[PDB]
Amino acid sequence: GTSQWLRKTVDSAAVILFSKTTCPYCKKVKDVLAEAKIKHATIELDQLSNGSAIQKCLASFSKIETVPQMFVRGKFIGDSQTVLKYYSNDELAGIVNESKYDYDLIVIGGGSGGLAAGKEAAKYGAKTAVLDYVEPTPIGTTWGLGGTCVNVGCIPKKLMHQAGLLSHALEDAEHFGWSLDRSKISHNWSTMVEGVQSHIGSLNWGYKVALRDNQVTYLNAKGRLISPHEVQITDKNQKVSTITGNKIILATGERPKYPEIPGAVEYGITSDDLFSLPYFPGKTLVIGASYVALECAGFLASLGGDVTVMVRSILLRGFDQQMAEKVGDYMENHGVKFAKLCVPDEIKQLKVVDTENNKPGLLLVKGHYTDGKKFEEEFETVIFAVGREPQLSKVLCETVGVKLDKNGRVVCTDDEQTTVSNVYAIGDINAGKPQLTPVAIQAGRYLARRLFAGATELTDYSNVATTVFTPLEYGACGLSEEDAIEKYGDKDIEVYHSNFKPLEWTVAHREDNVCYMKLVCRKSDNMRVLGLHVLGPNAGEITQGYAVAIKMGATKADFDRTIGIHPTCSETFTTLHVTKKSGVSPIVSGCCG
Amino acid sequence: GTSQWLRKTVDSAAVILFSKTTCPYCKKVKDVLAEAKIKHATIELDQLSNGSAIQKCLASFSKIETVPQMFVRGKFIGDSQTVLKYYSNDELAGIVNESKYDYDLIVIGGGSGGLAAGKEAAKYGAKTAVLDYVEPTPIGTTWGLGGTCVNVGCIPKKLMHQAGLLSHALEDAEHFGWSLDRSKISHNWSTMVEGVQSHIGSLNWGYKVALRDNQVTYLNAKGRLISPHEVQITDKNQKVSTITGNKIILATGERPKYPEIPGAVEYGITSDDLFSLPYFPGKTLVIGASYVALECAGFLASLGGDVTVMVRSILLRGFDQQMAEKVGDYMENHGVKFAKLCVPDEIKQLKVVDTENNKPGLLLVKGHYTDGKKFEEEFETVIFAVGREPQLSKVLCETVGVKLDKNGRVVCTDDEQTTVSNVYAIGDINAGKPQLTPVAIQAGRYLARRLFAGATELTDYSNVATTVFTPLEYGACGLSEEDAIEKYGDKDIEVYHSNFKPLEWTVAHREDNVCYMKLVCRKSDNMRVLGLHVLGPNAGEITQGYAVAIKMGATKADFDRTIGIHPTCSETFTTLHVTKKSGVSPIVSGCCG
Ligand SMILES: Cc1cc2nc3c(=O)[nH]c(=O)nc-3n(C[C@H](O)[C@H](O)[C@H](O)COP(=O)(O)OP(=O)(O)OC[C@H]3O[C@@H](n4cnc5c(N)ncnc54)[C@H](O)[C@@H]3O)c2cc1C
Ligand SMILES: Cc1cc2nc3c(=O)[nH]c(=O)nc-3n(C[C@H](O)[C@H](O)[C@H](O)COP(=O)(O)OP(=O)(O)OC[C@H]3O[C@@H](n4cnc5c(N)ncnc54)[C@H](O)[C@@H]3O)c2cc1C
Numbered sequence A, B: 001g002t003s004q005w006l007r008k009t010v011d012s013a014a015v016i017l018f019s020k021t022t023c024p025y026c027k028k029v030k031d032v033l034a035e036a037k038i039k040h041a042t043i044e045l046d047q048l049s050n051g052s053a054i055q056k057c058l059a060s061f062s063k064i065e066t067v068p069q070m071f072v073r074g075k076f077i078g079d080s081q082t083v084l085k086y087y088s089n090d091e092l093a094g095i096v097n098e099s100k101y102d103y104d105l106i107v108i109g110g111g112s113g114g115l116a117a118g119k120e121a122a123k124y125g126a127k128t129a130v131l132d133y134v135e136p137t138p139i140g141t142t143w144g145l146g147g148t149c150v151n152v153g154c155i156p157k158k159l160m161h162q163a164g165l166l167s168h169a170l171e172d173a174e175h176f177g178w179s180l181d182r183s184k185i186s187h188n189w190s191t192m193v194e195g196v197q198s199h200i201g202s203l204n205w206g207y208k209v210a211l212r213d214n215q216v217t218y219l220n221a222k223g224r225l226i227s228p229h230e231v232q233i234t235d236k237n238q239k240v241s242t243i244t245g246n247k248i249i250l251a252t253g254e255r256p257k258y259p260e261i262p263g264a265v266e267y268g269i270t271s272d273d274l275f276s277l278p279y280f281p282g283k284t285l286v287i288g289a290s291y292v293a294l295e296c297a298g299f300l301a302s303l304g305g306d307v308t309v310m311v312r313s314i315l316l317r318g319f320d321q322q323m324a325e326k327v328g329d330y331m332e333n334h335g336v337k338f339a340k341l342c343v344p345d346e347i348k349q350l351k352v353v354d355t356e357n358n359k360p361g362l363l364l365v366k367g368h369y370t371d372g373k374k375f376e377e378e379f380e381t382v383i384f385a386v387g388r389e390p391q392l393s394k395v396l397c398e399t400v401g402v403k404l405d406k407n408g409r410v411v412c413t414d415d416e417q418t419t420v421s422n423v424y425a426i427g428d429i430n431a432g433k434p435q436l437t438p439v440a441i442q443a444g445r446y447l448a449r450r451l452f453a454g455a456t457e458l459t460d461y462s463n464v465a466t467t468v469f470t471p472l473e474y475g476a477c478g479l480s481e482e483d484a485i486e487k488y489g490d491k492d493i494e495v496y497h498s499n500f501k502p503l504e505w506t507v508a509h510r511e512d513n514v515c516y517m518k519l520v521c522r523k524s525d526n527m528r529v530l531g532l533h534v535l536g537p538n539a540g541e542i543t544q545g546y547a548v549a550i551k552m553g554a555t556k557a558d559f560d561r562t563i564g565i566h567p568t569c570s571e572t573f574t575t576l577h578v579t580k581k582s583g584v585s586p587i588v589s590g591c592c593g
């Protein structure tokens, strides 16, 4: 494997130094490169099992087996005397910048994965360009650099969730002795949006400064891959040019879908519009049942809004259905209405949005239930959350040879490579992968290290933990109970479970036996934890550290031997004893023995 | 080991059935015992490696090698035909109740460890008594069943911490768009105390009902161990009697210390008095620097109080000192004053506590700094938090032979056994063990299983995670950085670290580069995580799941291969890259690449 690894490494690296930690010739070259501000990867062969073997293999490229060896874009450029000769003769800049292509890397898409890949690549002396363009929504909404999460996803949705959580905090503060009257306090949408948008603007700016400080070229331009090494760019002036790159990372993400019904595009909005909406949504219908649908419905209700969710079938398809039902039950018991087994037929406009007074319009939504009854109700705002899709026909010419799946996602190897060998795809467009920001970031950073620094480490997409930021949050890592049973059979599955009550809920007079957790375990594999699930406050904080234990193959016994931190919600994972098979109730009292 | 285990098991178990899961004779006995409401342990030999060997060993006690075999208090009572003979002849009640002693177990102390041990023992048919008495504080404060944590510890302190956290929640809610004016809202101490005390009363009651429902005898009586099997009890009427028990668990905990200075006992208070204080503490001096001192100072300041902490030397001795300094810096920057390098000499009374209007008194505290300057300041309340101590001379007669250490704590084996072989000690009085509620609970429950159900599992006291519930919380698991360096040497330690900023702090305009985390790792052991440390909100929820990974031997690579949950504070543990040895700043901007 050594010679194949060295061939791949040398071919792809922009600027790389084969070195040893203790070699003074290696230091003289490093000091020259640092003095010349020449960024590069370094492989210290004295720190590798197969270092002796890599030294021998290097003579296939350079005819030498000594360190240091410096390579540029697939070519041996010199030992220490040669690199110091180019430096002293003012030749070294020209040599380290020599390329068949404008860039070593072009990243098409300036979101979670693309920015992480481009910044990481630049660290190893890849000459990098990041392209980002935000096609406006149908009402004309656009935003700055950073992608879906930063501008219209995780960041603003979690901030608006925090605004919603602070309602319950106002309520609780009265029971804890604070002299405020919750009933007299109102929420101002636009004040909140201004604060969220100021934060997002600081991120848009921060990314532009980070790219400038890493010597990455940022182009606010729509990129189209027209051949393996050619990207056509279209700038704001509609000026069309071609730039060339050695490696191409496709990181273009997805955008909301609309249903094909009259008035949906004209009169509804999506999450892309919600997070900067200049008017308060008012009485709101959310059509959909994804995590986006429920998160948005939930914070809007907690802000004091009249909210209905129109559900075609089930909530949170693909997540553990027991947990999904508990998530929705909590919502229904806390001010969210559900129109169940219901689909929309038409959106009719009753009032146009008021762009001066910043007031919503008014819409008539017609739909129907599975039982044949009509749905007909007025809403000020209608939010579609009915899926997301890539729009790669925009992004790649069909003649380039990048294989897509039946959903228009990119078919990749376990190292993110497409069917075009210099072209990789990361993030939400990579078929089959969890569509999450930290997944796109790890994939992009690890890929950049493989391309430009001879790393071997792949991204592990297994047992990737999630959290749904509904009013009562839901954290999970691993299999749903139903998927565990389908895979291993019911007789090989043991489920430990318990209700719990946050201590913070006691004096606040909140619910007993609503927060809930379970461990789905495999009996024949030492009670291996296949899936962890928790409904409760701060569920992402609870779940994250257990992800490390599950990656390590935690068993039930590993959870039991660990001592709780008291008083916490998370400690309940360390004392679970009630099995589903026993039929014993998972309910709990305050204190027992 | 089998014959030694079987000898110990048979001698100690109150009522035990040796069984196999598939034996219909075993079922007939189980159904009779369940019908007669006779509780017992069961060992299913078909579920043990050495089951075949245990069957053979059983003939040393019973002369038979078949199942079922039923034992009572060290004696073989019968096979299936014999047990059904006693039942049919109304003899079985008398036989299963036959004992040399009043109880199989007497627990002296009805706190975290004792209640957990007694309830667990009762499950296996141990006839159990729990003794609890609360000696009043010097001002006369007392409370109900449940121990330090429930009444004057973790439970009320965390509830008053939540009351304090809700101040910052009121502040934040304005930036998130809520129309309240933080400056107009005040806190009412006594309203809060009423709520906390109502919760505590529900726990006191819950424990009494749980003991009644497990057929445990609860005596509100002071117990004194006068010989290995004899406990002298003194009831509220000062009636003195003796009860006898086979096994004795000492679970009597600790109480606050006072310094030997004039006025301390007469005019100061401790945490024992604070949690039910009927008057608002007002301007408060906390003398001490333990976690109790800082937690209490912190919530009192967040409630709007004028608070000073008098520190003799350092904060949080025994915890990582870098983290301790950050904890205190946050406090000092958020309304806690520190009188550093300062000790008290005298407390003078200026006003008596007002018991009708529920107002504090007034005190003059005289002390001195190491620099020779005098301290002289008025306070309404003075809280001593200057350690806790066991008071076992009260609890055990010196003639019984239970060895204590130089601090008056019980010297125990790794299975909680004292120098008196039937007498065990759990919780805060067990020398050398972390003084934590979940430690006392695991120790007590696991011990009861070893005594009464033939369990072998010991409590693991290593890498027990903690959280200090200061205004900015501090969670830890494993070694401090300084202890890791002392043990392994500086050259074998790598520390990864980062600041972070909760997303919830962005729109709220709270601090950059104050929350902080680090992993202290051992270079020569695959970068094993020796210690994890986090300063930030919800730090107990963050830290708990990583405790499971650390118990499993997590390395840095295990943290890196795990994918973050976004947006959370905890995810920062999955991307740490900056080492202390590098000298690179741990500060972070919002968004970089
Ligand atoms: C409402 C919502 C909430 C979410 N909440 C969370 C959450 O809490 N946690 C979580 O982990 N994930 C969350 N996600 C998912 C997360 O946003 C995505 O997984 C992540 O943004 C995907 O990153 P990416 O790099 O694949 O694409 P994106 O971040 O979508 O970035 C792609 C970028 O490329 C641009 N682009 C597209 N075509 C071109 C072109 N031809 N040329 C130039 N630029 C182009 C796009 O406009 C965009 O700026 C959420 C998503 C949504 C919609
Ligand atoms: C202010 C404070 C905050 C704390 N916060 C936390 C925290 O957040 N998390 C955590 O894990 N730990 C915390 N602790 C520690 C925790 O309270 C203890 O570790 C735990 O209560 C110890 O349990 P135990 O069973 O050893 O003793 P205890 O709970 O102290 O119970 C001993 C009981 O026995 C009684 N007793 C004593 N002598 C006799 C006698 N002769 N006969 C009869 N009864 C007797 C005592 O009065 C008491 O009721 C805190 C402690 C304090 C003081």
Ligand SMILES: Cc1ccc2c(=O)c(C(=O)O)c[nH]c2n1
Residues within 6 Å of the ligand: A350, A364, A376, A377, A378
């Ligand atoms: C509940 C309900 C039902 C029908 C209508 C309607 O036709 C209409 C209009 O202006 O067309 C306005 N509002 C309506 N509201």
Ligand SMILES: Cc1ccc2c(=O)c(C(=O)O)c[nH]c2n1
Residues within 6 Å of the ligand: B350, B364, B376, B377, B378
């Ligand atoms: C700051 C300060 C210093 C001294 C005294 C004092 O002697 C006193 C008294 O009544 O004795 C009351 N209050 C005081 N306050």
Ligand SMILES: [Cl-]
Residues within 6 Å of the ligand: A143, A144, A145, A204, A205, A208
């Ligand atoms: Cl921008």
Ligand SMILES: [Cl-]
Residues within 6 Å of the ligand: B143, B144, B145, B204, B205, B208
């Ligand atoms: Cl009581």
Ligand SMILES: [K+]
Residues within 6 Å of the ligand: A559, A560, A561, A562, A563, A564, A574, A575, B442
């Ligand atoms: K445990």
Ligand SMILES: [K+]
Residues within 6 Å of the ligand: A442, B559, B560, B561, B562, B563, B564, B574, B575
């Ligand atoms: K990671």
Ligand code: NA
Residues within 6 Å of the ligand: A557, A560, A561, A562, B457
């Ligand atoms: Na265990």
Ligand code: NA
Residues within 6 Å of the ligand: A457, B557, B560, B561, B562
């Ligand atoms: Na990794």
